[PDB]
């Protein structure tokens, strides 16, 4: 019942016989998932939650940064003070769910109110030792492979009137996205081994957007809701950037963030980029060319990272664009419901 701050531990299903890098890091750094999850509901309670000021997020930040240091080693790392050249071996890459638990003398409070916006009081509270499994999926614009909202879309913002405050959206309708790099023979041949594409069903996304647009009109009354491409920035933001199978995907989302979306299946152009801007620290990291064979990732869109157009309103239309780049917000989208 007291606000607390201490180091926590992770529990995974990491298998020691696994060469996948997340497991290697998880087997060595996490304890097995508790066999029986004990959760205690409190029948008459209230506590104030702040998803935007939570040490749990900053803790997973330090963890997900550590993972990427074992898994994805750049051939060259340029920062403001240092230059690194090293071996950049390829690795088998897959996110595995991570559970976050409280040590002895501490417990975790979980909001079970289905429509909690992440800031303020929740009339209904529970206590568990360990959080649900969260894949540390690193991405921009689109939130992938996260937990989904029970009843209705949720809008999370520290302050919506603050246009500089990122807007996390949690969906009630997962939308399947497949990004593939088609198979082709070798790097020496004439083929462009960095050409890639995604396929998202047009009707699914177009109708999901309408539901997001609907939930946003409730926080902005008497206004039109518009989705337009990114106003600019690094390539990681202006494109759906993420890592699929150890390779860095940059998927241009002009076809997704459009006011009128076609019914028919959508095809997004992507590119595998060696040269990437690091989210762990401010700097550039260069990775080796892509591996041979087919690279595919069937992922589920469960949330968004949006940024509203500021300034005087031209047409009484509030424009939201895709954004990201601070992976802590990705973690908040999951750990919003927990506090210690």
């Amino acid at each position: 019942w007291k606000e607390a701050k201490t180091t926590l531990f992770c529990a995974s299903d990491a298998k020691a016989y696994e060469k996948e890098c997340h497991n290697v890091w998880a087997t060595h750094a996490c304890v097995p998932t508790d066999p029986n999850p004990q959760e205690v509901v409190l029948e008459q309670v209230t506590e104030n939650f702040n998803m935007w000021k939570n040490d749990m997020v900053d803790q997973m930040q330090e963890d997900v940064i550590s993972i990427w240091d074992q898994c994805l080693k750049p051939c060259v790392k340029l920062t403001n003070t240092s230059t690194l050249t090293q071996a950049c071996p390829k690795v088998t890459f897959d996110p595995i769910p991570i559970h976050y638990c409280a040590p002895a003398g501490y417990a975790i409070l979980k909001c079970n109110n289905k429509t909690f916006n992440g800031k303020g009081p929740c009339n209904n509270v529970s206590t568990v030792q360990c959080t649900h499994g969260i894949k540390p999926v690193v991405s921009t614009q689109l939130l992938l492979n996260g937990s989904l909202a029970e009843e209705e879309i949720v809008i999370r913002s520290k302050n919506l009137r603050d246009n500089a405050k990122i807007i996390i959206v949690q969906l009630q309708k997962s939308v399947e996205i497949v990004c593939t790099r088609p198979n082709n023979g070798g790097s020496g041949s004439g083929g462009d081994i960095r050409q890639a594409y995604c396929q998202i069903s047009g009707r699914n996304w177009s109708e999901a957007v309408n539901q997001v647009k609907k939930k946003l009109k409730e926080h902005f009354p008497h206004k039109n809701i518009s989705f337009q491409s990114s106003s600019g920035g690094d390539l990681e933001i202006t494109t759906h950037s993420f890592n699929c199978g150890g390779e860095f995907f940059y998927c241009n989302t002009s076809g997704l963030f459009q006011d009128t979306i076609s019914n028919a299946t959508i095809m997004l152009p992507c590119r595998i980029k060696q040269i990437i801007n690091m989210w762990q620290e401010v700097g550039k990291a260069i990775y080796a060319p892509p591996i041979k064979g087919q690279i595919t990732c069937k992922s589920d869109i469960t949330g968004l990272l949006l940024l509203r157009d500021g300034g005087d309103t031209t047409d009484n239309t509030e424009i939201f664009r895709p954004s990201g780049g601070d992976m802590r917000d990705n973690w908040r989208s999951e750990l919003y419901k927990y506090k210690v």
Partner: antibody, heavy 118, light 101 residues
Framework: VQLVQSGTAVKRPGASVRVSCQAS????????IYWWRQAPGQGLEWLGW????????SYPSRFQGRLTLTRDTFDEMLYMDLRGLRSDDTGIYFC????????????WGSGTQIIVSS | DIQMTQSPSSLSASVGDKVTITCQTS???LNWYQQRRGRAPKLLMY???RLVTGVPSRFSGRRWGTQYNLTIGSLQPEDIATYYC?????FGPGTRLDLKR
């Protein structure tokens, strides 16, 4: 804790211009930079803000596509690129550090005078 | 977005006078700045009531509801300049203070 801006720059109409602030004395990546301009004897107009951490810029509709904000973390310098220079683009251009979620601007540059003329 | 009104548009006072200024905003988080001749603004108070270190005690601010007031206890030659009220990305129209003649 200071921002130091470029000097007076003159460019012909329809050309492109650059202004730069250099941060010093504080962690560059933790504070938004808001850009403002004011013509002579007039109020401040919003150019946009940029997030030094993630590079994300936001602009007002009026200047959409004509103005772009960029960052350089190795130099700790902020840039403001304005193109298609009209006559009304003449004026003094300021950069300010957004200190807090209150949105107070505590640290300001001393302004960059821009002049548009043949 | 935010609607902002500042009045009066102009004001005149002399040393030792009591000068009050007001701006109104539907939205919260107002801040006040001092802009002297040909110089960038100086942060005076943030949140309308909270004073920033390094600013004299002559300055104080109180706000009630949708109204924010800026008051100077004893004007001095330095203070004669344009004062703006801000909130988020929007700046007020501005009020310019001139010596009484």
């Amino acid at each position: 804790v200071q921002l130091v801006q470029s000097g007076t720059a003159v460019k012909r109409p329809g050309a492109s211009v650059r202004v730069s602030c250099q941060a010093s004395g504080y962690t560059f990546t933790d504070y938004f930079i808001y850009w403002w301009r004011q013509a002579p004897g007039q109020g401040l107009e919003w150019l946009g803000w940029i997030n030094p951490l993630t590079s994300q810029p936001s602009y007002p509709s009026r200047f959409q596509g004509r103005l772009t904000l960029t960052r350089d973390t190795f130099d700790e310098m902020l840039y403001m690129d304005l193109r298609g220079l009209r006559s009304d683009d003449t004026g003094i251009y300021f950069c300010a550090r957004r200190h807090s979620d209150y949105c107070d601007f505590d640290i300001w540059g001393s302004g960059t005078q821009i002049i548009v003329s043949s | 977005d935010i609607q902002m009104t500042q009045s009066p548009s102009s004001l005149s006072a002399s040393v030792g006078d009591k000068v009050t200024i007001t701006c109104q905003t539907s939205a919260g988080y107002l801040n006040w700045y001092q802009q002297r001749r040909g110089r960038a603004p100086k942060l005076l108070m943030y949140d309308g009531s909270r004073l920033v270190t390094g600013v004299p005690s002559r300055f104080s601010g109180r706000r009630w509801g949708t109204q924010y007031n800026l008051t100077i206890g004893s004007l001095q030659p330095e203070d004669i300049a344009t004062y703006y009220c801000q909130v988020y990305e929007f700046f007020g129209p501005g009020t310019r203070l001139d010596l009484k003649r």
